[PDB]
Design an enzyme around this catalytic site. Structure first.
Site, PDB file in Angstrom:
ATOM      1  N   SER A   1      -6.295   5.878   9.448  1.00 26.01           N
ATOM      2  CA  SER A   1      -4.725   6.114   9.368  1.00 26.01           C
ATOM      3  C   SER A   1      -4.779   7.214   8.238  1.00 26.01           C
ATOM      4  O   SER A   1      -3.785   8.019   8.150  1.00 26.01           O
ATOM      5  CB  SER A   1      -4.061   4.885   9.081  1.00 26.01           C
ATOM      6  OG  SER A   1      -4.313   3.758   9.460  1.00 26.01           O
TER       7      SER A   1
ATOM      8  N   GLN B   1      -7.456  -2.562   9.423  1.00 25.22           N
ATOM      9  CA  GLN B   1      -8.665  -1.597   9.491  1.00 25.22           C
ATOM     10  C   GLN B   1      -9.876  -2.300   8.683  1.00 25.22           C
ATOM     11  O   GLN B   1      -9.529  -2.658   7.255  1.00 25.22           O
ATOM     12  CB  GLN B   1      -8.421  -0.156   9.429  1.00 25.22           C
ATOM     13  CG  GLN B   1      -7.500   0.178  10.536  1.00 25.22           C
ATOM     14  CD  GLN B   1      -7.220   1.552  10.578  1.00 25.22           C
ATOM     15  OE1 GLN B   1      -6.145   2.084  10.544  1.00 25.22           O
ATOM     16  NE2 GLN B   1      -8.534   2.485  10.366  1.00 25.22           N
TER      17      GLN B   1
ATOM     18  N   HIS C   1       0.821  -1.299   0.110  1.00 19.20           N
ATOM     19  CA  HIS C   1      -0.091   0.152   0.114  1.00 19.20           C
ATOM     20  C   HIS C   1       0.781   1.210   0.113  1.00 19.20           C
ATOM     21  O   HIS C   1       2.077   1.172   0.337  1.00 19.20           O
ATOM     22  CB  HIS C   1      -0.942  -0.109   1.193  1.00 19.20           C
ATOM     23  CG  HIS C   1      -0.380   0.296   2.566  1.00 19.20           C
ATOM     24  ND1 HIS C   1      -1.039   1.270   3.291  1.00 19.20           N
ATOM     25  CD2 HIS C   1       0.739   0.139   2.877  1.00 19.20           C
ATOM     26  CE1 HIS C   1      -0.526   1.687   4.564  1.00 19.20           C
ATOM     27  NE2 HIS C   1       0.841   0.757   4.221  1.00 19.20           N
TER      28      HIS C   1
ATOM     29  N   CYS D   1       3.523   5.497   5.388  1.00 22.46           N
ATOM     30  CA  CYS D   1       3.559   4.340   6.416  1.00 22.46           C
ATOM     31  C   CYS D   1       4.828   4.085   6.592  1.00 22.46           C
ATOM     32  O   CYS D   1       5.881   4.065   5.359  1.00 22.46           O
ATOM     33  CB  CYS D   1       2.762   3.047   5.634  1.00 22.46           C
ATOM     34  SG  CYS D   1       2.836   1.607   6.806  1.00 22.46           S
TER      35      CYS D   1
ATOM     36  N   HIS E   1      -5.296   5.475   1.235  1.00 24.87           N
ATOM     37  CA  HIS E   1      -4.514   4.361   0.940  1.00 24.87           C
ATOM     38  C   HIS E   1      -4.636   3.997  -0.606  1.00 24.87           C
ATOM     39  O   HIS E   1      -5.740   4.190  -1.063  1.00 24.87           O
ATOM     40  CB  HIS E   1      -4.837   2.943   1.651  1.00 24.87           C
ATOM     41  CG  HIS E   1      -4.685   3.119   3.142  1.00 24.87           C
ATOM     42  ND1 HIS E   1      -3.932   2.648   3.903  1.00 24.87           N
ATOM     43  CD2 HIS E   1      -5.685   3.525   3.843  1.00 24.87           C
ATOM     44  CE1 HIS E   1      -4.005   2.873   5.140  1.00 24.87           C
ATOM     45  NE2 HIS E   1      -5.045   3.512   5.124  1.00 24.87           N
TER      46      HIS E   1
HETATM   47  C1  LIG Z   1       7.413  -4.786  10.331  1.00 28.04           C
HETATM   48  C2  LIG Z   1       8.411  -4.851   9.541  1.00 28.04           C
HETATM   49  N1  LIG Z   1       8.890  -3.585   8.965  1.00 28.04           N
HETATM   50  S1  LIG Z   1       8.060  -3.088   7.598  1.00 28.04           S
HETATM   51  O1  LIG Z   1       8.910  -1.921   7.170  1.00 28.04           O
HETATM   52  O2  LIG Z   1       8.214  -4.363   6.431  1.00 28.04           O
HETATM   53  C3  LIG Z   1       6.514  -3.036   7.820  1.00 28.04           C
HETATM   54  C4  LIG Z   1       5.931  -1.893   8.509  1.00 28.04           C
HETATM   55  C5  LIG Z   1       4.540  -1.837   8.736  1.00 28.04           C
HETATM   56  C6  LIG Z   1       3.650  -2.701   8.486  1.00 28.04           C
HETATM   57  F1  LIG Z   1       2.248  -2.709   8.675  1.00 28.04           F
HETATM   58  C7  LIG Z   1       4.226  -3.855   8.000  1.00 28.04           C
HETATM   59  C8  LIG Z   1       5.475  -4.016   7.481  1.00 28.04           C
END
Ligand SMILES: CCNS(=O)(=O)c1ccc(F)cc1
EC number: 5.2.1.8
Length: 145
Positions: free
Chosen positions: A136, A113, A41, A95, A139
């Site tokens: 949030s 969500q 996303h 994100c 998206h």
């Molecule tokens: C948790 C591992 N780091 S990530 O940046 O790959 C990541 C971040 C947020 C998420 F909701 C899913 C993956």
């Protein structure tokens, strides 16, 4: 038509198109459940997001209308091929998954969500959503598995 989809009429061209009210996807061609799905996303936060902060900006101040304008622009660039989803996600997603090209991994119903979950499970493999709204922010969702 499949569920989620409806016929619609283009206001500028008069040509029939198809719209999905679960994913907010729209397309010209007629469209034709998994235990888990895998999605990436691109999130654009706004001043009313649950946490108006991100790795990009300590204080996110853009309005929800401004966030939607940004999302709409990214969708245009992705659909024109001028930009790749993964590239825009790494650069501009609010994100923390930006660092993984937006990849969230695989997940079941009951973890995300609800508007995000419903859009994810209604996408076909490889298909991309329109703007999806959550607490949030806004998206763009790409179903990868
Ligand atoms: C948790 C591992 N780091 S990530 O940046 O790959 C990541 C971040 C947020 C998420 F909701 C899913 C993956």
């Amino acid at each position: 038509l499949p569920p989620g989809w409806e016929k619609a009429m283009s206001r500028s061209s008069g040509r029939v198109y198809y719209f999905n009210h679960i994913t907010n996807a729209s397309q010209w061609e007629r469209p034709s459940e998994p235990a888990r799905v895998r999605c990436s996303h691109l999130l654009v936060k706004h001043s009313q997001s649950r946490r108006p902060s991100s790795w990009r900006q300590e204080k996110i101040t853009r309005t929800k209308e401004e966030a939607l304008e940004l999302i709409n622009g990214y969708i245009q660039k992705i659909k024109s091929g001028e930009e790749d989803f993964e590239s825009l996600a790494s650069q501009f997603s609010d994100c923390s998954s930006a660092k993984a090209r937006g990849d969230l991994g695989a997940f079941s119903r009951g973890q995300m969500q609800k508007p995000f979950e419903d859009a994810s499970f209604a996408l076909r493999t490889g298909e991309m959503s329109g703007p999806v709204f959550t607490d949030s922010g806004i998206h763009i969702i790409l179903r990868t598995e």
